[PDB]
Symmetry: D2
Subunit: 118 residues, 4 copies
Amino acid sequence: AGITGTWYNQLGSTFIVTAGADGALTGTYESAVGNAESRYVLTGRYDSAPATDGSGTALGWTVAWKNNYRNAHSATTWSGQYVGGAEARINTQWLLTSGTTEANAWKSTRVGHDTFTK
Amino acid sequence: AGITGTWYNQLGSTFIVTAGADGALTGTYESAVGNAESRYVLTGRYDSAPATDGSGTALGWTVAWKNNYRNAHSATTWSGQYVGGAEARINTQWLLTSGTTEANAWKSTRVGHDTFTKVKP
Amino acid sequence: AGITGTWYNQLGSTFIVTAGADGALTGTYESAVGNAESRYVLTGRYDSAPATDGSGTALGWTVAWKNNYRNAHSATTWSGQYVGGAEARINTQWLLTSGTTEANAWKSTRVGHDTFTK
Amino acid sequence: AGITGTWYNQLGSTFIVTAGADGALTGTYESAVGNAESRYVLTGRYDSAPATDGSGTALGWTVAWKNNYRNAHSATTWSGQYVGGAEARINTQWLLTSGTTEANAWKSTRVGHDTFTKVKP
Ligand SMILES: O=C(CCCC[C@@H]1SC[C@@H]2NC(=O)N[C@@H]21)Nc1ccc([N+](=O)[O-])cc1
Ligand SMILES: O=C(CCCC[C@@H]1SC[C@@H]2NC(=O)N[C@@H]21)Nc1ccc([N+](=O)[O-])cc1
Ligand SMILES: O=C(CCCC[C@@H]1SC[C@@H]2NC(=O)N[C@@H]21)Nc1ccc([N+](=O)[O-])cc1
Ligand SMILES: O=C(CCCC[C@@H]1SC[C@@H]2NC(=O)N[C@@H]21)Nc1ccc([N+](=O)[O-])cc1
């Protein structure tokens, strides 16, 4: 409900997900940069019973960059927390791993942080 | 994509996957360290159509540290590549984020790296 | 000159550094959160001859959390780029490693991203 | 703190340090991979007064990928702990950031992990 919705990060990406009962996140992702074309499938997990304190709700999803238009041969996992409020945000960090040959395995991962607004 | 199987990272945590022909991962995860105990559910995505050159297959998945045995208010995202051959290893980096308050948001994410293989206790 | 100065991140930390001729960064750091008390020494490296394009200047320093008031037994390395301008910023990401016993080695590192303003 | 020595990560890059009694590291770094060639300078900080329990000594250092041989417009920060014993290993994670334009800022940082030891070619 708080999490279930449609979001947007600073890069302009579109994040449409449904916060499951089981603690499942399901939806689609449309990236605004990189070799992304249109929506991609997306799946993750969230804390069904977050702290009662003020803590945010932890979560994280995974976009495998393959659909009918492009296959960038690589997945991104966003790990972060949701914070409800007057400024409902979803703050995260993410990991861009690329299939590569062991000789490039070292420069295989790209790292960063996306902040979503609703 | 020998991906569907039972793997083991160096912490000896068990990871059990099944890769659908669509690009989805499902299954469980049982850590050997941390506020964990028993199986936690896992949901992921992976490249159903990987490059045919040498390139390894890419993948990712999440485990919300909550189940019937415990709730650690946190989640981990594994991101890396499945690399096949004689010994099959799936190489990843990970982000473990615990839910927190403003004052702590800053130190909410821990970062690490896990290597998984088909055998070892 | 562009880099040499005194900065501030979103957490309120104070970053005072001098951009060396050699490509050396030197100065002090005063953190606003964690177990930091007062200034700590700091040392790093920067790109002496950055791209002529529009690219930012890459850099990165290291604060070892020990001074006369506290020793949090841990170092932080910030890796990022400087971007001059009307909104001169220094965007980075950092790694908080803690001395620990191999049994906690796994949860040894803490990750994040600081954005500095001048 | 056997820290001052000659180490080697699994990529077989050479790292040469000297730890001052103040908490500073100095020396060079010679990668075996990437837009690197020859020695690049390195500046770091480390715990001069480490915990006496078991805890490993923490450390960090930076290498701006520029010298007389090449300029890759990027820098790497290694962060981790020196862990002594029979075989001495210094365990780190790293952030390699290349300078870029707005449109690319988003993919400027690569992340990885390196393990260093006193011997191996
Ligand atoms: O494989 C990629 C696919 C597209 C990347 C989307 C990323 S997910 C993190 C960030 N947040 C967003 O909303 N969008 C970006 N593209 C790609 C891969 C490699 C290179 N490269 O230069 O190596 C360039 C683009
Ligand atoms: O309760 C959690 C979950 C347990 C973490 C297991 C980690 S997942 C990365 C690595 N790979 C594995 O197979 N096992 C380990 N962790 C947690 C929660 C809060 C805090 N905290 O500091 O507040 C620290 C850790
Ligand atoms: O060892 C630490 C020392 C202080 C941390 C300063 C960090 S550097 C990244 C970030 N940017 C800032 O400007 N300040 C913070 N503190 C510490 C260590 C462990 C825990 N812990 O709960 O485990 C709490 C505080
Ligand atoms: O030119 C650079 C520097 C070479 C990187 C060596 C890395 S440091 C982490 C690891 N540990 C080592 O000992 N060696 C490797 N890299 C660079 C610059 C630009 C891009 N780019 O994609 O634009 C990629 C890599």
